[PDB]
Subunit: 222 residues, 6 copies
């Protein structure tokens, strides 16, 4: 992370203990655990430098997952670059004519950044760290994604709430665009729930358009 | 949370460890545990940004409970908006003519806030964070509520204090308006306690109008 | 708690972890445990706001004990009000003519304090927080008191020191005014201890007037 | 403890957790444990106010031990008062004519100190806190002392080092004036050690006058 | 580590607890554990002085491993010296004519540095600490390396991902120059994987040139 | 330890918890454990006052070991005094004519230092604390030393690395002057290792003069 000191931007390493701690969480709970995800997001709540993210991931992830994270990160950074190239006002760009970002800077490979977190802190702009961090985080999620919702049905002894949570987690972790998730989830609620639930949802008000709204409606009738 | 730095308002993430810790508390103790409630309230003792609350809840709550929290939060925020719309002096509103709050700001979706906790800290007013935080907390309580007081009776081997606590917890977690809770609780004490207790309470002074007052009176006579 | 910042008095929440921790202590050790008492006193060593004390107690205490604490606190606050009303120079009062304290302020219910720890910090005076805190603490002790010294006698296989500690704890936790405790304890030492101890104490110097003095005298003769 | 803030001396409570922690140490390890002693000394390394010491001891000690501590503390404070009365330049005294210390101040009972750690911090001088703290600590040691060295002999299967440590601990915890301890310990080494050790020590250089010097000499010959 | 204070650069020791903690990690998990490596890297994220690194390594490593670390460090420092000697603009050199670094300074043996972390902090330049730290870290990796990839083949019941991670770890820990690792790893994927995987990789696009790219391609087809 | 505050040098006690922690380490792991040594060195990384060192050692060491530490410390301090007496420019001496150090100051017994860590902090010079600390540390090592390398031979089922580490630890903990350790260790490698190792070392390059160099050479041939 970076903190503004008297002379200027300075590098401050992530606490070694939290890194080790997360490494354990990843190992004990798995990449797809809400605990892990929450902890990783927490550690990445403060803008990180390339040096921070690569060493963080290298440590908490296995050799293979780290290799996957690196490819995912590269792709994510490239999408940032494509956007920053198309829009001069992109926050990753500097205000000045010669301040557009590039892939070398985002990876901390540009002149004066190579293997130097202090130089990265001194040269990268706040907007670049935001992109670097969000990119690294998304890359982590992709790795966790790659670490079927359409076959999920409410079991005869399974409660609605358990089926709803199971189904929602599968859809949110799927390849669907986010905008398709709510309609897809509600369709599965209407079609794949047990007979009594299917009748509750059938006659629900037509204004209930989110999964949470439908869940409340059903739970209120149990 | 937000801290006022030299240049102005800045975002400071909630400690990752406390978030993970609460996630465990929720998982091990349950949503309706006084331990959980106490810990959540503690973590939400400092005004939070939309970014803080959504990521906090997404992490400590399961997919389903989080979907419920989101719907509850939306409702709570809307009640804030309704109040801020009716009263220009509402603390969530800015002093200036074009400073009334709106749902987009409270959700951190307004221009310059989207997915940016730093921008949220720079743009949201203290009063808006208070509303955002209180709203998020109430939404959490609602989720815990949805995670019967009228059938509770003092068992033949059950102590009064245990029946009183059991009954009070059921009434406080019920759908009654808060103003009805004390009269309802005292009525149940008078009618549903064991015969000896019913006689103690029968002749209690008419000035004892709270559950705590009646409990003391009974305990003093044991 | 309150800390004086640049702009003025500001609210700082009690650490969520210590609150949870105390909740555990109360649950595992009990209200009448010296461990609990010590920990509660420690947490209440810094002046607290109404918001701090009510949420602290609501969390660490069960529904019933909390209802009892609330009644006890009300009584304690009223005694403060009675004193502040009788003596204009009472520390809970402000120096100015219109600065006497009242029950609404002490409960954080006065204009601008309702459900707002920041406003409470900005409006309550240091002396009011002292009273609020001492009152809350005393209320806690009362609850622990209500959660017999006259029948305590030294058992035939019980050591004097154990009987002395047992007896002293019972007398200190009793309804006696504090000024009666030392004479009552020493009387019990003289009358209810085993025959050999009764003879040691019989001929003790007449200048030994505290329980600790008599204990030392006896222990010195063992 | 006291910290000098902008407006002046201010009270800062001892960390509740360390107090609870020590209470456990006292309970689990005992008063005469080097662990306890070390921890207590550590907690009392920073000058404490009357409020700090009494509440610290009340919490970590049982009712009886606390009553003993209070008597011991009173005696210790009186010795400080006797010294400060005889020597105007005593550090517990203020530089000014009307600044001699007295027992009421040291106990935090003087005008403006009663039950008020903030007032104690504002009124007590640094030298008074030093005396209050050293006195409280000595009182703790006395309590631990009261919680035989002359019969200790080296057992036939006991090593010299173990006998030496056993003996030294008994002599240091005894009623001997500190100046008598070294000669007494060395006499016991010469007379009460096993035959082979008695011969080693017999012909030791006459310049070895401390227990540590004699121990080294013996260990060097094993 | 070094922190810039008012008077200038000052030495601040690494937290004793993290050092002890890492010592345990090394002992319990081993030198070649990603946990250890991550923790060591974390502790060495802040520029260290010779005093910091030697005492850190002496403590966390056994006598033999420490002797190996010392030889490795010497070699690493010499490579730094060779580079700083060939390039006057090397960051380890001072801007002034008489400010080139030398082995004595890097080892903290130069005039005023010997056994004095405060003097080292006052005399060594930021660039020298960077070199000292990176050198110490590389020396640690070498020790871990010395604490076969060509025989690794995917087992008949072994998953591709497990074989890929196993193989990648062996190649990264090998004597190959880093530039040879990716081609060597991909060759092993093509030749030493199970028959079905060999067919997947055979017809992969010719643009997939990293191990991570090939892994993704295969995983996408499982 | 000492920290420079506004008014000047001030005493800050070592954290009670780390002291207790080390006491446990000493008790559980022993004085000759690399864990203990590392932890003690860590705690003594910041210049300590006489008050700090004596109370630190008194707490973490048993009565006997502490008595030994005190004698060792006295000897170490005297060597410092001998050096500071012979060289006026010795860092333990003040720049002024009447600023040479003496044993009373180093032990914190000089006027104004007796039993007063605050006075010690105000009167002792930085160089004196360095000497006091290094002396205390060396005294600790001596105690650990006194808490045979010539008979060590590589066992028939013992690996070279294990024999090398065993031997090196024995030689480093011996009475040899440090300058004799490397030649003595290498001689033992050549003469007391198993036959195959003896042949590896026999024909080693004549430039390999440290134990680490020879170890690497052997390990490279295994």
């Amino acid at each position: 992370p970076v903190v503004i000191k008297t002379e200027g931007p300075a590098w401050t390493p992530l606490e070694p203990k939290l890194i080790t701690r997360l490494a354990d969480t990843v190992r004990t709970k798995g990449l797809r655990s809400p605990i892990t995800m929450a902890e990783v997001e927490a550690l990445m709540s403060s803008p990180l430098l390339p040096h921070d993210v690569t060493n963080l991931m290298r440590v908490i992830l296995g050799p293979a997952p780290y290799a996957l994270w690196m490819d995912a990160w590269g792709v994510q950074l490239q999408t940032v670059i494509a956007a920053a190239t198309r829009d001069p006002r992109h926050p990753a760009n500097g205000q000045g004519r010669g301040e557009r970002t590039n892939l070398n800077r985002l990876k901390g490979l540009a002149d004066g950044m190579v293997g130097n977190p202090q130089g990265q802190a001194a040269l990268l702009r706040p907007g670049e760290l935001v992109a670097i961090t969000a990119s690294a985080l998304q890359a982590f999620r992709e790795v966790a994604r790659l670490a079927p919702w359409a076959d999920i049905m409410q079991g005869p002894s399974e409660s609605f709430v358990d089926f709803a949570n199971r189904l929602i987690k599968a859809v949110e972790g799927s390849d669907l665009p986010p905008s398709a998730r709510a309609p897809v989830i509600i369709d599965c609620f209407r079609q794949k729930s047990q007979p009594d639930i299917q009748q509750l949802i059938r006659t629900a008000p037509s204004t209930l358009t989110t999964p949470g709204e439908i869940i409340k409606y059903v739970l209120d009738r149990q």
